[PDB]
Amino acid sequence: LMDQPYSKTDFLMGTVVTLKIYDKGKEDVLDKGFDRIKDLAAKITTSDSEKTSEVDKINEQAGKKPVKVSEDVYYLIQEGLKYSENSGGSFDITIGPLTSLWHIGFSDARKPSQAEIDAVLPLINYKDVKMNDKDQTVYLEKEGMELDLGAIAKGFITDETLKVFKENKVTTSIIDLGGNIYVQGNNPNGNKWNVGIQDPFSPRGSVIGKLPESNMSIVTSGIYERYLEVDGKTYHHILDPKTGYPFDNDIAGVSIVSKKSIDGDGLSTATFSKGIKGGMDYIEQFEGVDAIFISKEKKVYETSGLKGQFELTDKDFQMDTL
Ligand SMILES: Cc1cc2nc3c(=O)[nH]c(=O)nc-3n(C[C@H](O)[C@H](O)[C@H](O)COP(=O)(O)OP(=O)(O)OC[C@H]3O[C@@H](n4cnc5c(N)ncnc54)[C@H](O)[C@@H]3O)c2cc1C
Ligand SMILES: [Mg+2]
Ligand SMILES: [Mg+2]
């Protein structure tokens, strides 16, 4: 193990992505990881105007014909439908027509008319995604439907990047997709990795404390990173499929701790829709998954499996219990 790692930084999927590898003689695995990230991003994205991704092709043929997909895309949609059903529909990967309408976080973000919202709300239904295992096809049964895998894609890509690392016998690494972090092994000095818990009121990178972890994923969601401000009001990017407007409760941010990044990524939307106390109860039903909640009043809460582990450092915030 090296003290100073091999590291590479790129700007993919609209954010800074950094990979670090501490195993001596594994520098070329950095390129293998970024190759895998770019491969999956091109299959999943709906934000490339000059190319038609696999998800784009599914959306173009909604209500027309099933679309052949690769194993990566078939699996991601498979899991997205599982998180959608488990959420009761609060999380729904068919929210595509609504999230494309607002386009929150992009240069052309817009608050749509109520008539525009009412036109896309009947299109959101995860049960209308028809899957054929033998043909490996995905079919949107209704015209106008659109998939949006943005809430689970980074977790899946993070897991697949770790798979490339493990296949190359990498033992000590840090995968940072911006809001999706996986720490592999321990610090070369023997300590657990001190993972920073994002400050939801400050730009990405600023933290309110540290969580020691090893071989674990930490995924972050918040309201102040991607939002649109019009006429005094702000609208964050986590939208309610039943109303067409953002989920507005007492959560400012939440960090979900899990063995697999797709699980923490996929559980975030349903957890977010339930507020602080309801979201904590939701996380307590998943063994091996825990979370740190941060209120709009700067109160910090730990689920049962994380009690006493989080090291709060920002004095603007206070630890609180239920
Ligand atoms: C493959 C890919 C390519 C991208 N390319 C670009 C790019 O070129 N330019 C750019 O500016 N951004 C791009 N992005 C978006 C960028 O990565 C965002 O910062 C990020 O996707 C926001 O998600 P999050 O993980 O930070 O938060 P999360 O909470 O994990 O994800 C929130 C996202 O999930 C979706 N969502 C919202 N409400 C719901 C709901 N109720 N149910 C289900 N899903 C919901 C929306 O897409 C929302 O943005 C891309 C994203 C992906 C996955
Ligand atoms: Mg995410
Ligand atoms: Mg997520």
Author numbering: 37 to 358
Task: List sentences quoted exactly from the publication behind this structure.
As defined by unbiased electron density, FAD in a bent conformation binds to the central cavity of FmnB with the diphosphate nearly perpendicular to the adenine. The adenine of FAD is buried deep in the hydrophobic pocket inside the cavity, and the isoalloxazine ring is exposed outside the hydrophobic cavity. The adenine of FAD forms hydrogen bonds with Ser126 and Leu275 of FmnB and establishes water‐mediated hydrogen bonds with the carbonyl group on the main chain of Asp184. Additionally, the sugar ring of FAD forms salt bridges with His273 and Arg262 and hydrogen bonds with the side chain of Asp184. Instead, the isoalloxazine ring is sandwiched between Phe142 and Met49 through the hydrophobic interactions. Remarkably, Arg262 not only forms a salt bridge with the sugar ring but also forms water‐mediated hydrogen bonds with isoalloxazine ring, which likely maintains the curved conformation of FmnB‐bound FAD. Moreover, the diphosphate of FAD is inserted further into the FAD‐binding pocket, forming hydrogen bonds with Ser257 and water‐mediated hydrogen bonds with His273 and coordinating with Mg2+ through Asp301. Two Mg2+ ions are present in the electron density model, and they are coordinated with the phosphate groups as well as water molecules. In addition to these interactions, one of the Mg2+ ions (Mg1) coordinates with Asp301, Ser304, and Ala187. Glu261 adopted a rotamer conformation that removed it from the catalytic center through charge repulsion, and Arg262 no longer occupied the position of the sugar ring but formed a salt bridge with the sugar ring to stabilize the FAD conformation.
